[PDB]
Amino acid sequence: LEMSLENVAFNVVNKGHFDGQQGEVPVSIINNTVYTKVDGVDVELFENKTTLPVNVAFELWAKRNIKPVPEVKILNNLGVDIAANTVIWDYKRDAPAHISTIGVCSMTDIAKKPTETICAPLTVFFDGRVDGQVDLFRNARNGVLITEGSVKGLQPSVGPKQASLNGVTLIGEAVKTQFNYYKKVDGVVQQLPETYFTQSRNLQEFKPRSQMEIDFLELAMDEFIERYKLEGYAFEAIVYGDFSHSQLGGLHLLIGLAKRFKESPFELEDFIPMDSTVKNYFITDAQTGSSKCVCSVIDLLLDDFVEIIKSQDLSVVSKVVKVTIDYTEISFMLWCKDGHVETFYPK
């Protein structure tokens, strides 16, 4: 089976997600909110933050994938346009990551199976943990596959260590969060390039993942630079920041932002609330009064960033560096002066 509003709310009340049970409950739809009648009074079940209708969004939210799914930025960078027989929820913007669906909700479905002729020119996302999806990927034209194990005849591309589980990004211990990504374009199995993966952390809950990051969050600016021989790579401005002018200087890695927030809190106005490899913020340091309207921030592994920046040439006045990060190319604006770097920030 029954595709209806009240069965979905039944499953939400009784199981927390649309599991497929049978039964119905009272439902009220007022404004963009879905209420239900429990003990004679109306309890809100879902408030619609999306641009879909209320019941469409409520049904999509209830049928969201509760397994560990890849982060939305990885799926966007791989070019995924639609997901086969599942809804992938974007908790950053409280909406589905993809506009249409395949065999999920009648209002959004462009097909009931990924093998129809309308899904052919679209990179479908196939979940190899679900039985029967690997063969669909094999017969598909454009698609992306993730698998915990190995698939015969296909060279795996090992993905990021972390994945989103119910909106929480974690490196799984009780569950596998590291999948092998296979991408097929026009019936030709492409090999994904060797990439770096961003760590997906945040300022408040920042935990270092390497001894170098521990040294960064622990040692002083001079001690850390001297210890790792980072002289002449402008780490004082690239990572630590410059809180002395009216405009904030540098600070284009999340680890430096976390260190500053530990020293003195500030304000990050994420004026585009979406998940991506490179984020822009509106920072305003509350102590010095130094603010910058746009600050491009990418949360690489500090060891990986060191490896990248030490593999460059400080010979030209400026150079744009192409690096594959999260299965996509990121262009870095390098401005290296004679023997030093004036600035090096993502664009």
Binding site for RNA (CB under 7 A): 21-22, 113, 115-116, 129, 131-132, 135-136, 139, 148-150, 152, 237, 245-247, 249-250, 252, 280, 292, 294-296, 316-320, 331, 333, 335, 342-343, 345-347
User: x/- site string to its own copies, residues 224 to 263, per CB under 8 A?
Assistant: -------------------xxxx-----------------
CA atoms 259, 265, 271, 273: torsion sign: positive
Question: What is the nearest approach in angstroms of RNA to the Cβ of residue 309?
Answer: 13
Q: Of the candidates 187, 123, 132, 195, which has an alpha carbon nearest to the alpha carbon of residue 158?
A: 195
Distance CA 84, CA 109 (A): 10
**On the CB side of 57, how many CA atoms lie within 13 Å of its CA?**
20
- Binding partner of residue 210 among RNA, its own copies, none, CB cut-off 5 to 8 Å per kind: none
Question: What is the nearest approach in angstroms of RNA to the Cβ of residue 318?
Answer: 3
Starting at the edge strand that comes first in sequence, how are the strands of the sheet with 340-346 ordered? 319-325, 328-337, 340-346
- Of 151, 170, 203, 230, the one binding its own copies by CB under 8 A: 170
- Binding partner of residue 285 among its own copies, RNA, none, CB cut-off 5 to 8 Å per kind: its own copies
Tally: H helices and E strands in the chain: 9, 22
- Binding partner of residue 319 among its own copies, RNA, none, CB cut-off 5 to 8 Å per kind: RNA
Question: What is the nearest approach in angstroms of its own copies to the Cβ of residue 115?
Answer: 15
Distance CA 266, CA 281 (A): 12
- Which residues, numbered 65-104, are part of the site for its own copies (CB under 8 A)? 66, 68, 76, 81, 90, 93, 95-99
- Binding partner of residue 226 among its own copies, RNA, none, CB cut-off 5 to 8 Å per kind: none
- Of 294, 313, 320, 338, the one binding its own copies by CB under 8 A: 294
DSSP letters, 283-339, are EEETTT--EEEEEEEB---HHHHHHHHTTS-TTSS-EEEEEEETTEEEEEEEEEETT
Nearer to its own copies (CB atom), residue 166 or residue 312 = 166
Q: Which two tokens stand for residue 231?
A: 């002289």
Q: Does 209 bind its own copies (CB under 8 A)?
A: no
Other beta carbons less than 10 A from residue 161's beta carbon: 14
